[PDB]
Design a protein around this ligand. Structure first.
Ligand code: E8N
Ligand code: E8N
Ligand code: ZN
Ligand code: ZN
Ligand code: ZN
Ligand code: ZN
Lengths: 330, 330
């Protein structure tokens, strides 16, 4: 049993402490190549990511899942360089997020399945690097094209055993429609993580997903604009619920019997061109720990609130390995 | 005086017979790298383009202006390879078309100007290849972002002397708003071609642009779905006006005194991923001459209708050189 990373297959035991929803860079296809000065320089972005991943590794992280798709401007050569330099495994993604270009938006469910399978089974671009996860997205009711993407993701997962992870507008309970479409294609919920689920406090929605077997992505714990005075763009992005409020959803699901279905992450980035200029600076001021926020702050917080070390080890080590290890029914 | 091509600067005399609105490939940023099998293979696309450009050269073409932007998936390395193999100069474009990703759509007018200037003055990606034209787009009333793109294009042209060429929804008379925005930034109409202008028969609109000094892009002459039975997608793309009807607009503008302001092209492509699957096959059935259609069919047609050889030489050689040669007022 092996998980594909940007430096090759690794064993399940090698994955270790794993952050399941992260980004080296949140961008757009071709953007880093065409306009590296937007990030200062490509080298500056690399250096920032390596420093961040090294600090995460010192805090105990061993693997991150970079859920950047084609249309987030995923650059697997960049991921490989940062992964080598920081000694942190990086799992790359296929799929499509919320900004597909026309050349993707016009494609059929069969064509999309071919593209996702290409990136899982053959390689990404000419790199030979294979994706270990499929990323999809809705923001409210699925567009007709997003329905095709979700179905193609299910077909690619059914052929390969690679899991699916989703972006939702959690306030619209998107996981319900995503589940319906996935299940219509015959995909096991055990192969699916419904992400950005910490954006909502609706326990009925969260437990309805977990009851049918879905993994719950509580993946934006440090995202908060509390204490940011009069920054409309940061408030729209990050919300005004505290990181403690988000983190307590981890305890809530544990207390309901779902500890094996919880996946926790920061949804951090080291560059961020697909939003307003200087958002990365704002985010780094909110959370200077970056990707180390989960082990340095969330884990001790949950221990203080009575969650055991063993349970948190299961959530951060056992659950990601069970999720990522290719299979049709985990 | 020199015009930048994908193989370096050329003199005005070297440009020769020039098609001012063409594409090697109409695609999306990063798409050819990530999914070359969509085109059969990258090599198959290269071979098809080289054969087409060789046939165009045999018909008299010496230069094409590839008006593919970043978001049309412009690959200047591909353009250079095809240009070398076919012995046809290719001018590359900067700017943005109708499918910018989030990382572009969130940018300011100043940021966009920096990006356009980068591609004109420094190089595209890491290739050192510099754009010789700026391409912009509206489809009806400009979106707020498209207003910024048009202003940034004007600023980049004012700094460099490189011309601007536009995509319009001609039925909505977009050239009127485009002109208004360009002029508000102080750009000379002599540096601007309002493209897809052969999509309309409205002489009041066309002469209103030409009267204030704009160049008129009659650039889709072979685009027609006449005789295509019950193909809705091809009819939506190509329209149901004949190529003869489009070509007679060249004569119409000559007869009104605007021969020096007419630019003629095919708006052909050798691959086309940003529309429905197999559209390239449909288009090649409509116009097997491809980019050779203008010299092989339109020029003799206009001669038969009484246009002189000298006038057509002025339109196909003199006007493109005057347009492309960098200057603030041509
Ligand atoms: C991990 C161990 C199980 C509890 C204590 C719930 C019984 C939660 C922490
Ligand atoms: C080019 C020469 C001028 C005419 C004949 C109009 C007088 C048009 C063709
Ligand atoms: Zn997301
Ligand atoms: Zn994310
Ligand atoms: Zn166009
Ligand atoms: Zn075009």
């Amino acid at each position: 049993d092996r998980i594909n990373t940007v430096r090759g297959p690794i064993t399940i035991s090698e994955a270790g402490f794993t952050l399941t929803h992260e980004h080296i860079c949140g961008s757009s296809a071709g953007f880093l190549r065409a306009w590296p000065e937007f990030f200062g320089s490509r080298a500056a972005l690399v250096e920032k990511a390596v420093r961040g991943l090294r600090r995460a590794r010192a805090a105990g992280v061993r693997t991150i899942v970079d859920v950047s798709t084609f249309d987030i401007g995923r650059d697997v050569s960049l991921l490989a360089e940062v992964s080598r330099a920081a000694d942190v495994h990086i799992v790359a993604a296929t799929g499509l997020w919320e900004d597909p270009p026309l050349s993707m938006r016009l494609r059929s469910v069969e064509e999309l399945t071919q593209f996702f399978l290409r990136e899982i089974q053959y390689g990404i671009e000419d790199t030979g690097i294979r994706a270990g996860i499929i990323k999809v997205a809705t923001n409210g009711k699925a567009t007709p094209f997003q329905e095709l993407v979700l179905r193609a993701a299910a077909r690619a997962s059914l052929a390969t055993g690679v899991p699916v992870t989703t972006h939702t507008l959690a306030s619209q309970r998107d996981g319900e429609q995503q589940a319906a479409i996935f299940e219509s294609e015959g995909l096991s919920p055990s192969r699916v993580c419904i992400g950005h689920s910490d954006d909502t406090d609706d326990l009925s929605y969260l437990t309805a997903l977990a009851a049918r077997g879905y993994l719950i992505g509580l993946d934006g714990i440090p995202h908060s604009a509390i204490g940011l005075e009069d920054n409309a763009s940061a408030s729209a992005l990050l919300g005004n619920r505290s990181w403690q409020t988000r983190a307590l959803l981890i305890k809530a699901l544990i207390d309901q019997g779902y500890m094996k279905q919880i996946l926790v992450s920061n949804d951090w980035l080291f560059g961020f061109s697909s939003y307003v200029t200087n958002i990365m600076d704002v985010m780094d001021s909110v959370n200077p720990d970056g990707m180390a926020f989960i082990p340095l702050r969330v884990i001790p917080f949950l221990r203080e609130k009575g969650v055991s070390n063993e349970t948190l080890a299961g959530i951060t080590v056992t659950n990601p390995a069970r999720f990522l290890s290719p299979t049709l029914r985990a």
